[PDB]
Amino acid sequence: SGFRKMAFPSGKVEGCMVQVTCGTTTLNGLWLDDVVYCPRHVICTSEDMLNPNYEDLLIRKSNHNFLVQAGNVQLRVIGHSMQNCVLKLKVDTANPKTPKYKFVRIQPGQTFSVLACYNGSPSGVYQCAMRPNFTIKGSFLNGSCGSVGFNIDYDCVSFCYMHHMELPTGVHAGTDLEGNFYGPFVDRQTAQAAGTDTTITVNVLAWLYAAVINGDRWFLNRFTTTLNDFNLVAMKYNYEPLTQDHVDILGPLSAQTGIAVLDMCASLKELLQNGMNGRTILGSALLEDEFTPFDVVRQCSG
């Protein structure tokens, strides 16, 4: 019993964190096999904030300009290349602690663990979700760039995010491990605004199923809804549209609890209308949207 915002154990990623220094800038790098991955903005000077030409800045660098530190050992950079917004520093030593891993690009609503790092050293681990506006609500200070987001399945680490920047609203933007930004963001200090964020409806429904599995039913009602009427209502509270894919995805939790998806949708519509009336659901007075259907099944069933 119980339901917590649970992160993956971070050890497999901790053994990959290194410090990358280029000039006056120091940030984190991810050392997998003989490559260190990090944000390409590590090559920017104070004059390359707004409109850096990374190809031009990179061509001027030598391998010995990149100082890479793995624990108390300086690694030797023997090559460098850029892939989209990530810099790949070839090193002369393969990381002996390289886990089984994959690079995966995630979709909005997906969750992942973040291992926040400073100076190549892990500081903490927390659970995140890719918001519908492609930002993440992380906890990051200056120096956290290059910290990564990941999931673990079996003994395989799926790296899905690399931290690049904080937007004016305190939310965070980054890329996958192929250097492609999530969202319409660029690794320039030109003014960029996150689009209006919305609630991840499918995740709220998953969390209501988690509540039912854990013994709570107070929010259930005798009603159902059509998918279209639900979306018309949900949109008025800035909830993401619920698609037939989301309904299908909720099938297993529906079968386990005996509450049809559209019946849970009617419960959600009522909660949006009434609020909680001093009650909580799984220790929260707000509807939680950073647990996916897959997270609920994993945490509640194994």
Ligand X SMILES: O=C(Cc1cc(Cl)cc(N2CCN(C(=O)c3ccco3)CC2)c1)Nc1cncc2ccccc12
Q: Give the residue from 11, 18, 36, 28 showing the smallest Cα distance to 163.
A: 28
Identify whether 41 is a catalytic site residue. Answer: yes
- CA–CA gap between residue 84 and residue 106 (Å, rounded): 17
**Residue 58 interacts with, from a second copy, ligand X, Cl ion, none (CB under 5-8 Å by kind):** none
Residue 249's CB is within 10 A of a number of other CB atoms, namely: 18
For Cl ion, the closer CB: 81 or 107:
107
- CA–CA gap between residue 261 and residue 267 (Å, rounded): 10
Identify whether 265 is a catalytic site residue. Answer: no
Contacts (CB under 6 A) with ligand X, residues 164-193 = 164-168, 187, 189-192
**Residue 111 interacts with, from ligand X, Cl ion, a second copy, none (CB under 5-8 Å by kind):** none
Structure tokens at 9: 């154990």
In the chain, residues preceding a discontinuity (C to N beyond 2.5 A) are none
What are the backbone angles phi and psi of residue 4, rounded to the nearest 5°?
-120, 155
Catalytic residue among 22, 38, 41, 172: 41
**Residue 191 interacts with, from ligand X, a second copy, Cl ion, none (CB under 5-8 Å by kind):** ligand X
Look-up of token digits 């530190």: 69
**Residue 187 interacts with, from a second copy, Cl ion, ligand X, none (CB under 5-8 Å by kind):** ligand X
Residue from 51, 107, 139, 226 in contact with Cl ion (CB under 5 A): 107
Stretch that binds ligand X, among 6-14, 66-74, 160-168, 204-212 (CB under 6 A): 160-168
Q: Binding to a second copy by residue 197, rule CB under 8 A?
A: no
Contacts (CB under 8 A) with a second copy, residues 69-128 = 115-119, 121-128
Helices 201-213, 261-274: crossing angle, 10 deg rounding: 100
Q: Give the residue from 224, 229, 109, 130 showing the smallest Cα distance to 173.
A: 130
Residues found near ligand X in the complex (CB under 6 A): 1, 41, 140-142, 144-145, 164-168, 187, 189-192
Residues labelled catalytic:
41, 145
